Structure formats: C-alpha cells, structure tokens
Design an enzyme around this catalytic site. Structure first.
Site, mmCIF file in Angstrom:
data_model
loop_
_atom_site.group_PDB
_atom_site.id
_atom_site.type_symbol
_atom_site.label_atom_id
_atom_site.label_comp_id
_atom_site.label_asym_id
_atom_site.label_seq_id
_atom_site.Cartn_x
_atom_site.Cartn_y
_atom_site.Cartn_z
ATOM 1 N N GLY A 1 7.760 15.410 -5.553
ATOM 2 C CA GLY A 1 8.607 16.435 -4.906
ATOM 3 C C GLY A 1 10.011 16.414 -5.506
ATOM 4 N N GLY B 1 15.463 19.813 -2.994
ATOM 5 C CA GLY B 1 16.080 19.158 -1.843
ATOM 6 C C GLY B 1 16.250 17.650 -1.810
ATOM 7 C CB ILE B 2 14.471 15.224 0.343
ATOM 8 C CG1 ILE B 2 14.977 15.713 1.708
ATOM 9 C CG2 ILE B 2 14.203 13.730 0.329
ATOM 10 C CD1 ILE B 2 13.871 15.781 2.767
ATOM 11 C CB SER C 1 7.983 15.127 9.253
ATOM 12 O OG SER C 1 8.710 16.046 10.105
ATOM 13 C CE1 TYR D 1 5.301 19.007 6.672
ATOM 14 C CE2 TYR D 1 6.304 18.783 8.855
ATOM 15 C CZ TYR D 1 6.330 18.564 7.487
ATOM 16 O OH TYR D 1 7.388 17.912 6.916
#
Lengths: 233, 233, 233, 233
Positions: free
Chosen positions: B13, B17-18, B137, B150
């Site tokens: 990823g 972003g992160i 998350s 999710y």
C-alpha cells in the site's frame, strides 16, 4: 535526536526499576525529570545514577500534603509538567480467604487512591497537549492465583485512563495506560510468554517513551501491553 | 537519532496516504524502503517525493506471482527484510442486503488473502528479530453501518497478528497490528473522537515506527489503536 | 416451562454435535426446528433422534441456490423465522508456511461467505424482534499454532454480530455470537481451562438457548464465551 | 419449568431495582431467596412484593459484623448457598477535579470492599458447584464524564470475577460478572444504544438468571454485557 527536548517530566515510583529506567531514558531524550519516592536514601542514589537534569523529591504519594509539597517544588523549579508518569505501585499476594482489611487498604491506597490524587494535583501544572501515563498491569486482565486486590486495583487504573481521556480532552491532555508483563526487577511467566523471556526495564521505559513523546500524538485512552505477547495469544 | 539505521523495510500500500507517510518517516530514520503498489505512475511519484533510499516495485499483492517477483527484487537489491508493513487495504461500503459475491471477494482478497500471502512469502527473507506490522482498523471492533465485509476482514487481520506471534516466536519475529481511526487521506468520526479531529498520516506513520523500532522490542501480538480515543471511551 | 413455545428456529450445521444438541434443546423448549446439512443420511438420522417438530433440509450453505431452496421450504412450511442459529463451520489446521489458496478458500467459504449469505437470505423471513446467533470460537481471540485461517475467519464472524446489530436494529433483531472453547464432539485445552474439563454439547446448546430466548432480550452484539474460563483468566 | 427449584439464593442490594426484579424471578423459578439491604422499611416492602419464599436481612455489606450476622441467619434458616448475587452498588458523579477522599472511600467501600467481604464470608456456606454473580457495569469499559471512581470500581469488580474463577475452581464454583447498561430504575444512553431504549430490570434479572442456572454451567469468568449493544458496536 531528542524526543523530549526541554520537556518536564514527573515520575512517581522513581527510585526503583521501571521508574528508574524511564528516568534515564527521559534524560537521554533531553527531558528534565523529577523522580518521586518515599525513601530519601534510594532517591538520592537514583538521582546519582541518572546523573543530570534530575531533581529527587521525597513524597508518599498516598499522602495528600506530600503531593502538595511535590507540586510546590515542581512549580518553583520548572513551572509546568509536560509528561506525568504515575508509576507508583505495590503488590502483595493474598488469596480471597486470606484477605484482611489492612491488605485491602494497602493495595488500593497505593495503586488507586494515590494515583487519583497524584493526577488530580498535577492538573494545574499540566500543559495543554501534555501526556499522562498510568501503570496498570497484565494482572488487570488475568485471573492470577492470590492476586485478588492487585489485579482489581490495576484494572481500576486502566479504567481511569478512559475516564480521564474524556474529562481532559478539552485541554488536549492524552492519558494512556501501560500494562507490563513480567519485567526483570528488584520462569512461570517466561514459559507462557511468546518472546520466551522476561522484559528488561529499558524495554518498558521505551514503551512509556512512545506514550510520552509526539509519536503517540493520536493515541488516547489505550492499554498498551508490554508483556512479550503474554495476554495476546 | 536514526531509529531504523540501515534497516530494510517493505511497505505494501506504498503509494497512497499512510503507506507514503510511513515510507518518508522510515527513510528519515535511516531505513532503506521498498514501496509496493499496483499503479506504476503513482509509485514513481511516491518514490520521487520520498527522494532517497527507496525502490518502487509494481505488484498486485493479491497475485502470488507478483509477490514472488517483489521478493526476488528485494532479495537481489538488499538481501533481507527487517520490517514488513503489510498495509494494503481497500474499503467498499455495502449493507448486508447489498452484499454480492464480487463485493465479498474483492474485500477479502485485498484485506486478508493478499495479506496472508504477502507475509508468507516474506518469511524466507525476514531477519530473526524482525518486526511485522499489520493494518487492521477501528472497524474491526465496531458495528458500523454498511461496513460488513471491511470490518470483518479487518478483524481477521487483527487475529493473524496473534497467530503469527505464536508461530514466529522461535525466530523472535514480532507481529503487531495497528488500528487507525479516522485519518485524513485521499465530521461524523471527528465528533465522537475525544481528540476532536481526524489523525494526520504522519501520526499513523509515527505509531507504525514504534512497532517497527527497538522501542517496541517487548511488545508482541497487540492491537495498537491510533484513533484519538474513539474506541477507548 | 417452554421458553421457545411455537417459535420457529433454523439451525445450520444441524446434523453434528452442537447443532444437534441445540436442535434437541430447542424442541424440548417447544420450538419447531429446521436442521440443515450437506449429507442427507446424517440429517435424517439427526431428525430421527430429535424425533418431533423437526424438518431436515439438505443444503450446502456455501451455495446461494441451496440457500434459496432452504428458505422456500421454510416459508412454505412455517412462514417465519424467530431464531436463526448460523452454526456451520469447519476447521483445518495449516501453519502460515503450509497455507494454500484452496485451504484459504475452503475455510473462508464455509466460515464467513456461507454465513453472510445464510443470514442475508434469512432476512425476508426473520420476524421483527427475532434472534440470530453466530458461531464464533475462542480461536477468534487466541494465537493457536496452525489455526491461522480458522481463527481469522472466526474473528470475522464475531465482527459480523456487531455490524448486524447496527444494521438490523430498526427491526429489533438481536445478533449475538457464541464462542465455544473445547466441546466434546465428533487434554491440552482441558489443562488450561479453569473448569478442568471439555464442555458437553448440551452445555453449549443451553448457552445458545439463552441467546435465542427472551431472557437475553436486552443482550445485543456480544461475544458469549462458553469455554469453562479458558479465555477469561 | 423451575430453573432454580429448591436452590438457596443470597441477593445483596435486595430492596431496589435489579436486586428486587432478580429476587422475583428467582422465586418464580422455585428458589428460596434472602434479600439484603440497609433500610428495614424498604426491605420489608420488597419482601411483601415478592410474597413468598423470601427472608429480608438488614445488613450493611460494608460492615464485617453485619456480614457475619447475615451468614449466621442464612446458615440457621437454610444451611447453604447455591447462588450469590453480589449486587450492592452506589453511584456518585464527581470529575477528577472534584474528587474528595470521602467520595473516593464511599465509592470503593460500597462497590469493591463490601463486595470482597460479601464473597469471602459466603465461602464456607457456598455449595460446591454453586454460582456467584457480580454486578459490574458498562461504565467499567467506558470513559464517562464524572464517573471516575464508579467506573474504576466497576472495573475492579469485573477483574474479581477472573481471579475468583481461578481460586474457586477446586470447588467448581463459577464466578461471572454482569455488566448492565442503562436500566430503568429508581435519553443520552438510549440514543447510542442499538436497541433504542433503556433496559427493564426484568431483563437484567433474566440475564442474572442465566448465570445463576445450569444453562451457564460451562460459562466462567465472563463479563456479560446487558446493555442493548451500547458497548458492542
């Protein structure tokens, strides 16, 4: 390089073990540190070992007036608190059958009552955006033989981090609990621990440092387990 | 000064972003970083922004052969992995009524299946004493409208950190899950969050750095909430 | 005397162990019960043992059309569902190294995918105020050697109870997860368990009964551990 | 039909709310019930409303000699205890700033000290295989404004269920914590609760019944949330 440069930190339980290791790490990261303890001899030895940027303050955090005096000294010397590590704690083993009122009072006075007032009286000195770290324990989530009062007290501590998170958010003060497993200090736990060894106090200090530093700036109200996996598997 | 000096880190990823913020922080801490992503354009822009000590690797972590290729490249260029940040993830909202098999497969492929194989194929390159960080998350411990798959996937992720803690302890590899709340990335959450704002990616990167660095050396199997208090109060 | 009098219950995983014991206890409490299973022989034996107020329905809950068929039969015979016990599950042990895509797909298809569709398709038949019970596992909060996909799947199940609690509250449908420890069914766990023995399927059925009955009318979204204390101490 | 036939049950916090509702449900299930309270007038009214199979005992559970007296009466009249529901609790709101030593002592004396001794002195009368239920709270896992001492005390309670589960396993006594959310007793909580309403005391009595009865014979050390899903989503 210096993650606590010019910050002022107060550390109760300051002479022994975790408190001491945390104090060294805080100084190494450029903080000014007050260590707090009942015994003047040990405190002065601790301050000697730390060596710089440290004031030892004799206080029994279970006594309100000792707290007033500690905060008067902190205010005179450095004005404000950036980091409060409320780490005073004491364990005595007694099974439910063995519990006396004295045993109950000792454990809850040092672990919960002392803590509440330590933090209450730090409030007027705490900087907005400051960080408060409470010492809970893996015992707070386990059913350990003869740890009745201690575990229960340490669960009360973890709860305080939640409540204080809500109450102090207006001032942006973060409150988080650290829950150590077995730390080598002044084989049963080591067997059940995935990392297969007790923790070093330095390793606990390092975790407290995270919570103390800007790196945890979006971390609030948590229980950070530092136990080699003991409670996680 | 440099908490990841000469360490090799892989970050899936990696373009957005992160992943991006973590890559910058890791480089700033003296790490060599591989960023991983599907889209070559974005990856190269990301590597441009990072600026030094970075290799971009095109891969779809859901595809086993893409993983084999990634690890071949990592092996050629740097030999070993010290830090694996398995952070690829994708959210599509559908309520229970709306769930189609394609929706279910997308979510679990990217969040769980991809993750399992990412970590499986990193095993031969992972150094003893290395550190693996999984992105779970807050959703994994909440009941959020339309987040069915999710949230469930992210709960599976958190579980894997426990299992892998047990399975990899012989090699001293720490596995820990990070659970972000609302992060500002490419008002409902901000209202319920004690810190009263969404988190900056930098703040998440800083949390991942903790788990990546020696400072968390006695932290194993945990779920580190980085959510401004959302799930803690 | 009859805590499920005239209620209609559907129980997937209905021929074996927990499913079967729950079916008997439900019938004893005055329910009408559908048991669901892949193998017709075993189902018919199970229905024979139960003896009254029972329909056996052959279905592979992993197959959407089998679900449609099950619900058409339930609609024709009894009209509505008061209690859905989604209890189909399957465990295969593989370490992270050993995981193949087939292994991953088997585990998640039966444990999560099947479950999602089982509950999705029950929605039009579910009565307002009804009660859905999902079978998670103690594995969903532990780090057990070689239980990688199973534990992760069961954690995804526990998560679904939370989401569905939110999504179905408008219709007053309660969703709760039951998490068995070791149940005697068709010494390691028994050692670590405070009650010092594996559980009987009747004892699990009794816990599912709680969640099924009016007694748990203010209980929603929980994970009910039925494990003799394994995960609690 | 009668899930507590001829069992003997002791219920502290007996006159009001949850204590009362639980007393009624116990008698309806064939139990003999001792209710315990400080105020003789309200006790006697409570006994009157229950109507049969009940003895009212005046006692301040924070006073050791009151407990001795309670247990002497129970021993004389019935011999043994099958079910102890330790349900005396008291809430006073104070923020951290407002906390006095009296408020601290009041909250911890009634919620924790009283509880410990209630259970300690029940031990010689408790039957092997008996069941102890502790009243915790949703507060014990939340951060609620001005609930500092109450939430912390209720977390101590839930911890005691874990410790006592381990210490009492030799005698097969189960210990479990019930954690109510908002119960209608002598709109903020109702808004955040998935069930969209406060709980009736009957509904909490029903949950305690579960823990008291054989249906929960494999359930030990748990925290049973009875809060409409408040803490679960």
């Amino acid at each position: 390089a210096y993650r606590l440069l010019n910050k002022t930190a107060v550390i109760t339980g300051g002479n022994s073990g975790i408190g001491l290791a945390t104090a060294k790490r805080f100084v190494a990261e450029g903080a000014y540190v007050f260590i707090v303890g009942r015994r003047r001899k040990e405190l002065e030895q601790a301050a000697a070992e730390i060596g710089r940027n440290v004031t030892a303050v004799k206080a029994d955090v279970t006594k309100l007036e000792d707290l007033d005096r500690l905060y008067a000294i902190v205010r005179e010397q450095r004005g404000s608190i950036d980091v409060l590590f409320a780490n005073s704690g004491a364990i005595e083993q007694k099974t439910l059958e063995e519990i006396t009122p004295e045993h109950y009072d000792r454990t809850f006075d040092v672990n919960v009552r002392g803590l509440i007032f330590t933090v209450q009286k730090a409030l007027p000195l705490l900087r907005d955006g400051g960080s408060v770290i409470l010492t809970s324990s893996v015992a707070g989530v386990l059913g350990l033989q003869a740890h009745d009062t201690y575990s229960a007290a340490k669960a009360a501590v973890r709860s305080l981090a939640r409540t204080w998170t809500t109450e102090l958010k207006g001032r942006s003060i973060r409150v988080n609990a650290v829950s150590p497993g077995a730390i080598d200090t002044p084989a049963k736990f080591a067997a059940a621990t995935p990392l297969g060894r007790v923790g070093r106090p330095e390793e606990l200090a390092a975790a407290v440092l995270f919570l103390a530093s800007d790196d945890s700036s979006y971390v609030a109200g948590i229980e950070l387990f530092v136990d080699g996996g003991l409670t996680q598997v």
